[PDB]
Enzyme design. Structure first.
Site, PDB file in Angstrom:
ATOM      1  N   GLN A 214       0.806  -1.215   0.000  1.00  0.00           N
ATOM      2  CA  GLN A 214       0.000   0.000   0.000  1.00  0.00           C
ATOM      3  C   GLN A 214       0.839   1.265   0.000  1.00  0.00           C
ATOM      4  OE1 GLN A 214      -3.193  -0.214   2.746  1.00  0.00           O
ATOM      5  NE2 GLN A 214      -4.090   1.727   2.063  1.00  0.00           N
TER       6      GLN A 214
ATOM      7  N   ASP B 155      -6.931   2.776   0.325  1.00  0.00           N
ATOM      8  CA  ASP B 155      -7.612   1.702  -0.406  1.00  0.00           C
ATOM      9  C   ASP B 155      -7.208   0.303   0.052  1.00  0.00           C
ATOM     10  OD1 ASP B 155      -5.032   1.916  -1.621  1.00  0.00           O
ATOM     11  OD2 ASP B 155      -5.826   1.574  -3.638  1.00  0.00           O
ATOM     12  N   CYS B 156      -6.937   0.131   1.351  1.00  0.00           N
ATOM     13  CA  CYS B 156      -6.560  -1.189   1.864  1.00  0.00           C
ATOM     14  C   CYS B 156      -7.538  -2.303   1.474  1.00  0.00           C
ATOM     15  CB  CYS B 156      -6.340  -1.082   3.385  1.00  0.00           C
ATOM     16  SG  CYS B 156      -7.704  -0.411   4.337  1.00  0.00           S
TER      17      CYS B 156
ATOM     18  N   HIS C 286      -8.826  -2.171   9.341  1.00  0.00           N
ATOM     19  CA  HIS C 286      -7.873  -2.369   8.257  1.00  0.00           C
ATOM     20  C   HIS C 286      -8.083  -3.742   7.622  1.00  0.00           C
ATOM     21  CE1 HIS C 286      -4.131  -1.755   6.046  1.00  0.00           C
ATOM     22  NE2 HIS C 286      -3.578  -2.821   6.596  1.00  0.00           N
TER      23      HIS C 286
ATOM     24  N   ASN D  61      -1.120  -8.405   5.799  1.00  0.00           N
ATOM     25  CA  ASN D  61      -1.347  -6.969   5.858  1.00  0.00           C
ATOM     26  C   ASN D  61      -0.968  -6.341   4.514  1.00  0.00           C
ATOM     27  OD1 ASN D  61      -1.218  -4.246   6.394  1.00  0.00           O
ATOM     28  ND2 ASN D  61      -0.160  -4.474   8.373  1.00  0.00           N
TER      29      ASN D  61
ATOM     30  N   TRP E  24      -0.169  -3.467   3.750  1.00  0.00           N
ATOM     31  CA  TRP E  24       0.992  -2.595   3.889  1.00  0.00           C
ATOM     32  C   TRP E  24       2.267  -3.282   3.404  1.00  0.00           C
ATOM     33  CZ3 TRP E  24       0.297  -0.554   9.631  1.00  0.00           C
ATOM     34  CH2 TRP E  24      -0.772   0.359   9.646  1.00  0.00           C
TER      35      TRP E  24
ATOM     36  N   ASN F 157       8.691 -26.311  17.930  1.00  0.00           N
ATOM     37  CA  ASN F 157       8.026 -27.551  18.285  1.00  0.00           C
ATOM     38  C   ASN F 157       7.131 -28.069  17.166  1.00  0.00           C
ATOM     39  OD1 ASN F 157       9.031 -27.811  21.112  1.00  0.00           O
ATOM     40  ND2 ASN F 157       7.938 -25.862  21.348  1.00  0.00           N
TER      41      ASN F 157
HETATM   42  C1  LIG Z   1      -7.160   1.013   5.317  1.00  0.00           C
HETATM   43  O1  LIG Z   1      -6.781   0.512   6.564  1.00  0.00           O
HETATM   44  C2  LIG Z   1      -6.007   1.772   4.659  1.00  0.00           C
HETATM   45  O2  LIG Z   1      -6.096   2.089   3.523  1.00  0.00           O
HETATM   46  N1  LIG Z   1      -4.840   2.093   5.475  1.00  0.00           N
HETATM   47  C3  LIG Z   1      -3.709   2.835   4.926  1.00  0.00           C
HETATM   48  C4  LIG Z   1      -4.067   4.325   4.850  1.00  0.00           C
HETATM   49  C5  LIG Z   1      -4.812   4.912   5.859  1.00  0.00           C
HETATM   50  C6  LIG Z   1      -5.135   6.269   5.797  1.00  0.00           C
HETATM   51  C7  LIG Z   1      -4.731   7.053   4.720  1.00  0.00           C
HETATM   52  C8  LIG Z   1      -3.976   6.470   3.712  1.00  0.00           C
HETATM   53  C9  LIG Z   1      -3.648   5.109   3.766  1.00  0.00           C
HETATM   54  C10 LIG Z   1      -8.323   1.966   5.367  1.00  0.00           C
HETATM   55  C11 LIG Z   1      -7.945   3.224   6.126  1.00  0.00           C
HETATM   56  C12 LIG Z   1      -9.163   4.199   6.281  1.00  0.00           C
HETATM   57  C13 LIG Z   1      -9.506   4.699   4.970  1.00  0.00           C
HETATM   58  C14 LIG Z   1      -8.912   5.987   4.626  1.00  0.00           C
HETATM   59  C15 LIG Z   1      -9.315   7.039   5.598  1.00  0.00           C
HETATM   60  N2  LIG Z   1      -8.862   6.753   7.036  1.00  0.00           N
HETATM   61  C16 LIG Z   1      -8.777   5.273   7.404  1.00  0.00           C
HETATM   62  O3  LIG Z   1      -8.443   4.932   8.490  1.00  0.00           O
HETATM   63  N3  LIG Z   1      -9.397   1.266   6.055  1.00  0.00           N
HETATM   64  C17 LIG Z   1     -10.633   1.092   5.319  1.00  0.00           C
HETATM   65  O4  LIG Z   1     -10.752   1.506   4.200  1.00  0.00           O
HETATM   66  C18 LIG Z   1     -11.751   0.334   6.027  1.00  0.00           C
HETATM   67  C19 LIG Z   1     -11.534  -1.125   5.647  1.00  0.00           C
HETATM   68  C20 LIG Z   1     -12.745  -2.012   5.897  1.00  0.00           C
HETATM   69  C21 LIG Z   1     -12.507  -3.394   5.276  1.00  0.00           C
HETATM   70  C22 LIG Z   1     -13.723  -4.282   5.538  1.00  0.00           C
HETATM   71  C23 LIG Z   1     -14.031  -4.394   7.035  1.00  0.00           C
HETATM   72  C24 LIG Z   1     -14.185  -3.018   7.693  1.00  0.00           C
HETATM   73  C25 LIG Z   1     -12.975  -2.118   7.404  1.00  0.00           C
HETATM   74  N4  LIG Z   1     -12.972   0.842   5.470  1.00  0.00           N
HETATM   75  C26 LIG Z   1     -13.397   2.186   5.764  1.00  0.00           C
HETATM   76  O5  LIG Z   1     -12.771   2.909   6.487  1.00  0.00           O
HETATM   77  C27 LIG Z   1     -14.688   2.593   5.071  1.00  0.00           C
HETATM   78  C28 LIG Z   1     -15.464   1.685   4.354  1.00  0.00           C
HETATM   79  C29 LIG Z   1     -16.590   2.401   3.800  1.00  0.00           C
HETATM   80  C30 LIG Z   1     -17.706   2.058   3.012  1.00  0.00           C
HETATM   81  C31 LIG Z   1     -18.629   3.048   2.674  1.00  0.00           C
HETATM   82  C32 LIG Z   1     -18.445   4.358   3.108  1.00  0.00           C
HETATM   83  C33 LIG Z   1     -17.347   4.694   3.877  1.00  0.00           C
HETATM   84  C34 LIG Z   1     -16.399   3.698   4.234  1.00  0.00           C
HETATM   85  O6  LIG Z   1     -15.251   3.793   4.987  1.00  0.00           O
END
Ligand SMILES: *[C@@](O)(C(=O)NCc1ccccc1)[C@H](C[C@@H]1CCCNC1=O)NC(=O)[C@H](CC1CCCCC1)NC(=O)c1cc2ccccc2o1
Ligand SMILES: [Ca+2]
Ligand SMILES: [Ca+2]
Length: 322
Positions: free
Chosen positions: A77, A82-83, A240, A264, A266, A284
């Site tokens: 990432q 967009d994780c 995440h 992960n 990342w 083990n």
């Molecule tokens: C994910 O962990 C990620 O991309 N991490 C790296 C990162 C973080 C922040 C900036 C740049 C790069 C994201 C991180 C979030 C999204 C970006 C904004 N801040 C964050 O913390 N995590 C997600 O996208 C989560 C992932 C889901 C996966 C399925 C199970 C639940 C978690 N999703 C959201 O945050 C999310 C999903 C949706 C759907 C519709 C509307 C809004 C929304 O937000």
């Protein structure tokens, strides 16, 4: 066969550019601020500072589309939330047939190169063929968004760009659900499991789904907005998307222990508990099983016992083709 997204014909465009001696410029998704984003990645945003657009052939001497296979280690990432999508791509690489549909192999930066690539995506109930030109967002000479652990490999950067294109911008991908990426790569349907209320045969369900080539992911719930991306004491990440990439039972201390492997997106930051890369549990297990399963590498991928997985993670998703 796939429908051509926006009527763009990969082979005709490539051939025209090759005959013209020119490089493809995608009029449907140009290297302009609006393709990066609208607000957080918008024109007047500090997060777009220093971002330029460069083709891999403008960056390195020998850029490659695919190096040592298109595999999950190629999904690291970048600066984009967009994780969920990247976990879906990593899981896709475990299904060889779907991987080779989504990612047309044999595209190259050498012979036949005209600055254009294409991918297949499942969109609104059908497979569609999406072209991109190979201009990619770069800052300080590096890809700003997804990149491979191999610095000269670009198939995953270009696949993420194609997904951005069908969404109108990179920023449109920030924050999402892994199920959407799973389905857009397979045409399948996602089943969701709450691990606190899991059936007694969930481990067998996971084993069979991995064996079939389904796409699996997992995550830890947040309690508040503050938990978003919080790193726990044992270096799990909350809110995440993880890819579930393996499962195997091993003989351990006179019992059979069910292990599960996840990654992960990342490409770094891993569980530190039992069955982690350097943990003592591997002492083990059978030496062959230890050699087959354990890889001592900070790559984002690690094993946990199924018991610990059910203690630490909250949700699991399984996208089946069927
Ligand atoms: C994910 O962990 C990620 O991309 N991490 C790296 C990162 C973080 C922040 C900036 C740049 C790069 C994201 C991180 C979030 C999204 C970006 C904004 N801040 C964050 O913390 N995590 C997600 O996208 C989560 C992932 C889901 C996966 C399925 C199970 C639940 C978690 N999703 C959201 O945050 C999310 C999903 C949706 C759907 C519709 C509307 C809004 C929304 O937000
Ligand atoms: Ca590779
Ligand atoms: Ca590891």
């Amino acid at each position: 066969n796939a429908i051509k997204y926006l009527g763009q014909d990969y082979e005709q465009l490539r051939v025209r550019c090759l005959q013209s001696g020119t490089l493809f410029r995608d009029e449907a998704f140009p290297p302009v601020p609006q393709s990066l984003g609208y607000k957080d990645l918008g024109p007047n945003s500090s997060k777009t500072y220093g971002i330029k657009w460069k083709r891999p052939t403008e960056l390195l001497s020998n850029p490659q589309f695919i190096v040592d296979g298109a595999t999950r280690t190629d999904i690291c990432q970048g600066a984009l939330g967009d994780c969920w999508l990247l976990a879906a791509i990593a899981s896709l690489t475990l299904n060889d047939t779907l991987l080779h549909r989504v990612v047309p192999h044999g595209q190259s930066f050498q012979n036949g190169y005209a600055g254009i690539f294409h991918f297949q995506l499942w969109q609104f109930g059908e497979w569609v063929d999406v072209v991109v030109d190979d201009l990619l967002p770069i800052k300080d000479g590096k890809l700003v968004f997804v990149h491979s652990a191999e610095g000269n490999e670009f198939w995953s950067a270009l696949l993420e760009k194609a997904y951005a294109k069908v969404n109108g911008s990179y920023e449109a991908l920030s924050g999402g659900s892994t199920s959407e990426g799973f389905e857009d790569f397979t045409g399948g349907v996602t089943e969701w499991y709450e691990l606190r209320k899991a059936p007694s045969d969930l481990y067998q369900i996971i084993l069979k789904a991995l064996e079939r080539g389904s796409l699996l992911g997992c995550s830890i719930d947040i309690s508040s907005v503050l938990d978003m991306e919080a790193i726990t004491f044992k270096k799990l990440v909350k809110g995440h998307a993880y890819s579930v990439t393996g499962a195997k039972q091993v003989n351990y201390r006179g019992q059979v222990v069910s292990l599960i492997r996840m990654r992960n997106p990342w490409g770094e930051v891993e569980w530190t508990g039992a069955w982690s890369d350097s943990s003592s549990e591997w002492n083990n297990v059978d030496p062959y099983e230890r050699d087959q399963l354990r890889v001592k590498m900070e790559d984002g991928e690690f094993w946990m016992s199924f018991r610990d997985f059910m203690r630490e993670f909250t949700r699991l998703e399984i996208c089946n083709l069927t």
